[PDB]
């Protein structure tokens, strides 16, 4: 009888916690199943019924799936407090310049990121791709390159300084996550949709 | 020319961004790509040529697949530092009382608890399977639950106290990692593995 949701890292990480603690000390015997994965991963464990609630990035016109817009999410490209990026006034030419790490191939991230920003800059070879958010911030504190996260995901080292945001002179990058489920399918669901909002 | 590894959560966030970071500092050229995956999961990528490096909780005794042992890494039962759990000597009926957060099914970490511990523990419903160390770490700080993880993902948070490493009355929950790749396939790939010991 557990409930089985399946989320993105940054959702999963940084958005569900606290939706997850709250639910929990009002029903503590409900058991919680929490998977994370990217979008197309997550529709088809839906569509497979393997999984009850999906949160994804971006929108799905399937007509087995019944799917809500559920949260704005805000991406930031931030650097090293030590950057030599944040010394001059930000080019497109001098993001091009900067070695970039980004999230893996079909994630949501990696999706904003590539034809949001990547497509209005100069071109560049790729320096790193790590699929876990913790790698990438591992990665930019130690100025292996730069990195455009989700606001969410580096707010706690925005505020300390390990990690500072970069203004960059193009339009911001949000994006829409969705809250999915199956057609074909409920009680218990439903409160635990009812603490998503 | 990008070098591809493949390997779990742990390995990827808390082993290799430190490998990582001296390996781009006396190779900036050579573009890297990290994947977050299961065994099962690289052990695939490996024999489809998908990736060029494995590292995997386990071992491997495919012929196919060069394998040997990396690194041990030692798992640890920890709590809130608010936890009842702290209070009193630990048996192994108290440690089955309290509710329980699990890394997701198939994961090394998950296997080393289920084998290891949980098999020696009075029978319980798991309240929780998260599939991200984040967010378990989070659902502990919380009192949500107890946990089990490597040392190394709760090392900081070992450190500053928000969280407490709880003493078992079992043997010690220690697992070896393994380095693989594919019998027929290099430099460069020898120049990270020589950055990995």
Same mark, same amino acid.
């Given at each position: ?26 029903? *503590?015997?409900?058991? !919680?199943? &929490?998977?994370? /994965? +990217?979008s197309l991963d997550?529709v088809? @464990? $839906? ?74 800059? *100069?071109?560049?070879? !790729?320096? &790193?791709?790590? /699929? +876990? ?5 591992? @990665? $930019? ?57």
């Open positions: 009888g557990a409930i089985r949701v399946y989320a993105s890292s940054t959702i999963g990480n940084y958005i569900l916690p606290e939706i997850i603690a709250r639910y929990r000390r009002d029903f *503590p015997d409900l058991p !919680l199943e &929490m998977s994370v /994965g +990217n997550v088809q @464990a $839906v569509c497979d019924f393997r999984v009850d609630i999906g949160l994804i990035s971006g929108p799905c016109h399937m007509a087995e799936i019944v799917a809500q817009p559920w949260l704005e999410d805000e991406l930031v490209v931030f650097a090293s407090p030590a950057s030599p990026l944040l010394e001059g006034e930000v080019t497109l030419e001098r993001l091009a310049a900067m070695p970039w790490i980004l999230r893996e191939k079909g994630s949501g991230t990696r999706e904003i990121v590539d034809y949001l920003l990547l497509s209005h800059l *100069p071109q560049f070879r !790729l320096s &790193m791709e790590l /699929g +876990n958010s913790e790698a990438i911030k591992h @990665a $930019v504190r130690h100025g292996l390159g730069v990195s455009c996260l989700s606001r969410r995901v580096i707010a706690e080292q925005l505020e300390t300084g390990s990690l500072v945001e970069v203004k960059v002179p193009l339009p911001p990058l949000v994006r829409t996550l969705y809250r999915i489920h199956h057609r074909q399918k409920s009680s218990a669901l439903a409160r635990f949709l009812r603490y998503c909002e």
